[PDB]
Design a protein around this ligand. Sequence first.
Ligand code: CA
Ligand code: CA
Lengths: 508, 499, 506, 510
Amino acid sequence: GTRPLTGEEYLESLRDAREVYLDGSRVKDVTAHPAFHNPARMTARLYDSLHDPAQKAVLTAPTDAGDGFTHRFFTAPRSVDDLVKDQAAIASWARKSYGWMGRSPDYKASFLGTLGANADFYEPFADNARRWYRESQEKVLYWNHAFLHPPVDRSDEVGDVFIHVERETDAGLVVSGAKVVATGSALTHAAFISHWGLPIKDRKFALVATVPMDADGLKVICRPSYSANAATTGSPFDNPLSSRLDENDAILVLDQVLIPWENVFVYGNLGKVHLLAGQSGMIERATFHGCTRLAVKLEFIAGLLAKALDITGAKDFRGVQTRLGEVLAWRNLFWSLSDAAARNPVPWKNGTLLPNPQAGMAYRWFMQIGYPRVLEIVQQDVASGLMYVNSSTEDFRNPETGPYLEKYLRGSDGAGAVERVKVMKLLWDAVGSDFGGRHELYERNYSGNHENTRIELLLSQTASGKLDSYMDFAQACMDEYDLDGWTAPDLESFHAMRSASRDLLGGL
Amino acid sequence: TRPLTGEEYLESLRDAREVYLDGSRVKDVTAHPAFHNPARMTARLYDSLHDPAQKAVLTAPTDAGDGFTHRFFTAPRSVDDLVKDQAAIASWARKSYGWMGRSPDYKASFLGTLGANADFYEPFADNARRWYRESQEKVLYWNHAFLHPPGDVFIHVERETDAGLVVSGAKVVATGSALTHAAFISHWGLPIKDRKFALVATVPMDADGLKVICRPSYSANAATTGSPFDNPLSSRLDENDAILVLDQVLIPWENVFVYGNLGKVHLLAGQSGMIERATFHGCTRLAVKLEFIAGLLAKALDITGAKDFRGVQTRLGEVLAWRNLFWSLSDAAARNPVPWKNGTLLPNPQAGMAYRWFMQIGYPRVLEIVQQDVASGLMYVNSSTEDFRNPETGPYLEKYLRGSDGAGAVERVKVMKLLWDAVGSDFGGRHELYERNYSGNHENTRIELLLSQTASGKLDSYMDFAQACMDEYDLDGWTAPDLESFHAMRSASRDLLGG
Amino acid sequence: TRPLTGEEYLESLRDAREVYLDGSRVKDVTAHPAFHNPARMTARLYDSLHDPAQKAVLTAPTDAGDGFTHRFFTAPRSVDDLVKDQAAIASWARKSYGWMGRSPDYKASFLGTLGANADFYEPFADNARRWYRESQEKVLYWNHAFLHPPVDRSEVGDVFIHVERETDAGLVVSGAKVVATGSALTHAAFISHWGLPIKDRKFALVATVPMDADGLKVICRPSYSANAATTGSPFDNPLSSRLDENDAILVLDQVLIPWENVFVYGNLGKVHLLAGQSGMIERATFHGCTRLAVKLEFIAGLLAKALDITGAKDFRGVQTRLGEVLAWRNLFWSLSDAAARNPVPWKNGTLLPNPQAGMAYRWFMQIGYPRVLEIVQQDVASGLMYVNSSTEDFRNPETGPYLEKYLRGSDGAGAVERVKVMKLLWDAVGSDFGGRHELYERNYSGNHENTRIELLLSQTASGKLDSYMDFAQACMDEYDLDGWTAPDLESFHAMRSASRDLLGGL
Amino acid sequence: GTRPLTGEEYLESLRDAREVYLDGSRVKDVTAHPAFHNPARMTARLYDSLHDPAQKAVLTAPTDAGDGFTHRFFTAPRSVDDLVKDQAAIASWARKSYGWMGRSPDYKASFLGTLGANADFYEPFADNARRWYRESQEKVLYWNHAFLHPPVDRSLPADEVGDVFIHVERETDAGLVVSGAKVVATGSALTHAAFISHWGLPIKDRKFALVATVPMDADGLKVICRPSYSANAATTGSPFDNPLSSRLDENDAILVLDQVLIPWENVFVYGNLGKVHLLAGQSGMIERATFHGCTRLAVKLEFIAGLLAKALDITGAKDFRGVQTRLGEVLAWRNLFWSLSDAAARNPVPWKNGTLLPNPQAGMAYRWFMQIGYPRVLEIVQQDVASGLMYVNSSTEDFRNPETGPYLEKYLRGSDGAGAVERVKVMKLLWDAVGSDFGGRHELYERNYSGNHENTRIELLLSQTASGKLDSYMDFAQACMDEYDLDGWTAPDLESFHAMRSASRDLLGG
Ligand SMILES: [Ca+2]
Ligand SMILES: [Ca+2]
């Protein structure tokens, strides 16, 4: 009746008039350019998996309308069993990219999956949500989350650097402005414009809507591409992760883009723009998605580290095994947070369920200390062994250097130099490369800075009265005694021997 | 057939147990200041078992069905049961505000599975079946004495009589032992591989030959030199980590669980199922304790007025983050269990093995934040309660020790001393040391997780995961058909640096 | 002349001082268990000043030249002096094993500079010049009472030190100070302020008050030494029973402060500058850094003995963390070395210890010392609980033989030795005494935020931060959007553009 | 008089028959290839500074022979004043490379500067040391420290895997035929000669007990490079987009010897298995190398601190209290390594022939606190600047392109009132220092610069155990225990309070 996109169909959808810029040049074909080519084929694997009959039970589910099937995470869960199956689907796609591609098409489904039960929240534009929910289910659409405001000067009415309406036509809304760190945007179908907060509180800034990536006026200015650089100066062997998994955090610029009314979710309502960051249900599911994925990535890094320690022979050392288990401990933590999130949900709109908020609010903090610790352990237990490597694959083919490398760069496993160098460069690409550096910064500030993640945690529990409960808990301990002694009947104060002991040092 | 009551439990301790403290033998354990109030606190747990308003949370039938019992003493057979297990554990944890770790329900992590795991203890399988029945019926209080003292130093058999087994040796850090009904003698690992050391059994605390040498009592010191106000936690919640010494104790055959079988003694620390439930219990309890400390810290910061500052609020939320962590680990443990013996379920091992590590870094961090955000405000206190009654000092304290909250000096000193007793006292120090090494030293906890994942092939799975990535390319480029290697522009760029 | 002896110092405490503890007034401070043994320890310090074998390290002339005094009570005029100052401080630190931080030589960080920095205290500059003289002659024991008591702010500020009346005889002052550590065993409390807090003439007061002054009261915190006397023993509580410094509340009730005791009054400006211009903070960090280095040696030796007994010393992982403690030990000796040997010029040819070395100490002590205590709790672990209640258990025939059988060390040590070190180590780490010292060394100079903030402010005001930014700016000046601006560097434009062309038509 | 090398002379000295490999090709001219071109020009700046009359007082000193002058650190100090001047000289050259080029020519001078007073230690080859000391002073030679053994398979017998180590294969009349390899030979491709040494002998055979110097143009010696971050920046980056990596990259290359003839005049130690193993602590290098690295790291932290300050000033996060605490934290670490360096220079230890070594314990501490301090500094940047580092464009051409240029200038301005160009300039410089391949390598570098995080602490424990300092600490602790026993105090001046203790015990009697 109705199927989602295939790998090729997704690729064809990117071959439009989108205006992507990189290294001063405009990218003619996004699916052909080295910066996006292999990443696009990687995303195509996700779409192709939806059509594999051996994976349909895990990955797919009916599309509410029932005319077809869709990616499971694009549908609202109505039971714990659904959320457990949601977890498997997320972990499935995560493994296909080895846990590195955070902005896979299923991530933004953390928002899209709630447009069905939470449509009325977007009044008067509630019907727009009702259709985009239907369609994003129908095609399994790829949206990017553009919400971060660009840096602004403080010197005068020039607040127009923000996304803003310049004109209200009958067709829709003429919009100019920009958003930063629009990760993966160049390979998406549409940019979802939102805000973490309005600096100027006027109607023209209060806009939440989706815009097609080929919209006239919309331009994409890329950050330096680690995948493109790996194509020209590196190799699949020397740069296994960066060359095919790099998600470009590009600048998204709108120049008088016409946003149709059918694409608007919120407009003018500064409250709903504010309430979106906590009542949309995205953050509960986004943390649910990210935690499950991070758990998968840790398995990959743990396996990488384990193979590395076997090759260097450091696996035999006791201290090294402690830190390896430490990496495994963090792996179990995020699997447990994901388990708690999926299996201990909270009731939401129209009989649907959101993953455990308290499991999600904790993930935002421990990711900022856990992931760097993992990267630190690698730098500590492998150390300079990561630098025991050659320039490129040409060094092994060159008769002048090849034999030397195989003689002096062997592993302890009985492994060859090729195997050792292969793991070391793979590990380094995950830890010390431009790609690894970006991902460390990524997993550290992915949801917010290290202060706000904890503060928003305090505020959330204060508002929910949980903080009041903790203080009442402590107060219950204090109510059981006073300056005279215990107030609880079943406890003895030992007034006699206490005063007797006090008198033992009397007159001194 | 109801379990023991609070008063009945107290009477059960008034036996011929040989407890020593400060060079003297303790005549009445339930009367001595070192154990009096802690025993009364333990009595509260037993009394809660009989409250009709708490029966739904705390209780369940006794397998035989002739009565009821504490829920954790029964083997879980569903996820719903394990969620209720969590509620029961959290309930008793709150009654002691999360400080009494070796409560009677903790050792039930072992006792609650002796029914479904009886045949593992052959030929003494019937011994497990009775101790399971009885521990259900009365809710018995056992202490886990397993830590070896630094050949005759180990628990060992000296003689095999027809009546039972003559045993000498010792155990250290027998926490709460003096107020328990029986010591469960076990081992984590055998230093000497001999039959006489391969012994797992329970011994009554009033058994002739068994002696208890106490650690310094923080509750006794608080009774004679302190007060319930100046020492709110230590004076009534102190669990003495005493030395447990056996001198030719006769262990009846009906009390032996494992003997001679060198395999089952070694295998016990991983096949008994205790470790999955003990971590489940401890994690649930620690989550409760963190709530208590969080509420304490919040009151402290509110009184000092430091709650308004942004930096302080970040670290307060950090404490709440750790609180959510152990609740999530407990949630994951209870709601994602693994199948076990006789249709029963063990809590998630993967959640419990993580708990043993993050507790060693999390709990000290919480105590550290208190020392950082309250700082010298913990020392803004007077010697004792008599200072408030003394006309010479009383009014002065009331003037100079008020809080920013608009609070009085009495309230401020009350919070500070409660917080300090939780963080910096001998009681706080012991508990810092406890929560750090309660399950093992900071090295073994991580290694045993690695060993557990290595044996299960999970570690092998991770390496296969990484290997799958390497199989998609080689020295030539990608081996996957759908990927481009860009050999042309790569070699073209190499030519830019030719000669 | 000469400073006080051990007996003379003890006799000086037997005055009309009003010390309170457990609701009762202490009749004789030198006799009460709370202060008895700690006072005898301080007496050791005074007695060391008269030992001919220690005169070269500890002593120096007294400016007037009519006698001698403790070396740190004189202003250093050379690097050699500051090195000898370090030796004097380290000497007294070892006598208390680095625990009694508020020893009489600590307050000399302020007192030792009243000579060269007397005119800063005008018009009361002459009061400073003789109190400099007098505190030098006897080696007076002053406590630094500067921390303001908690206030409600909901609206009178009578909790702060303030003048209630100005007589011709002196100044009538009421108020309080908190965490007056060691005050009960001191000769006089030196009242100062870090906070303003309110812009009023009458709160701007810096002066000294005798500890036996009528109206002055001392309200003690729970005494760890007194409790160890009644429920413990020197064996079971070796540090707390004799080294406990009571952080008491210091209360003034209409105390008449003579004009001869005033250092600063009314001058609201100098009170603010007092923290940065008294010179004390440079020397106080110098004193504390040297002492902490001494204490770490004590803990390191303690830990090593414990690990040898538990047998954990043979393990590689344990040795790494043992070496980690030694690393911190070397750190504070190096900070002290940099402080003593790289000083800064000050008033009248005198020198202050290196400020940059001392200000770093205020931060790394907050992370270093807890780490040391943590390693002990990790590598000794539950072995600290492998102990008996008290010494009576060894004497009891019913328990004695058992302890000696089951509580032996792996080194071949007896139970007595094992319990001895284990109780000594615990008293240093996990007891009320150990907890208080962790909290102390953590907040010794200020909370963990201000120590870093005051560091930023100090380098910003000195233009040092400006220097760092100019350094980075010098790098940016060597290139721009065109390429390098430096002549000797190549931009490789031809090759770069050629590589850019590799992605043409894509 | 005699002068050291100039910038041009140093560059010409590299234009020899050195066999350097990179990206499968042999480098024809090292001074011309992008991988080494700009790094060589930066090193050339150091040599040129020696001839600047405005810098001779700080940088230079007589050359023992007195026939000329030389870099001051190549001479042995005889006073505290000398080591303070040494500190200034090291800090001077460190600033010229902004504290990044760790293996500068003066680093290996930590060894060469001691060949004068410690010549007789290398008998019978003492005269070889005396002349290489003489010559290295005269031109300020650039040596690289190759000591790290290449990876070996411990599942094979040592008979098979000892050909991986540097070893003598034959003793000719001319010298010694040597084969083997060394790893992480940082900066080797731009050096004059490789100093072959060992961190102890792994196999105890005469053939491995070899300590000698080999010219970089020696026939048989090959250099296999690690991926060059400067070369990649030349083709895909720019001085604006990659300010540090493109000109400060030190390649940690593999150094391979294939039947290289080492002349007898170049041998320092041979056959003496004792001196080779004992050298790592008796050469005096470790005291000075830690002294050099500590002084340099202090300089680098100032550069990073200034960078962070500008970044926070631009983002406007500098006004926040929490951000200022961590900024001061970076300044705290900055003060730390200056203090460690001060203690090293101003509290030295006596050595051979009236010369002085910097404080060893100040240096032994440096080897540890660098492994926790520097990552913390880099962490603070990722925390306080955060995603603001990704607020950047692909390259400088985006500003030149009329289609994107104006947009960047409008939307990427700073809070400072700064333009977009300046902001992107600072962010890309900061990222190149923190998150780039160059930054990653440098994080790994400062982490294992002296050794892995375990050995650095253990060697400290062993050093203090051997010196009896560890026993001294235990005697300190013992002095406390000697003052009491099971009876009470043993010290006369202390009261045991036997009365009230037993009285209190009786209150809890029966
Ligand atoms: Ca503590
Ligand atoms: Ca990093």
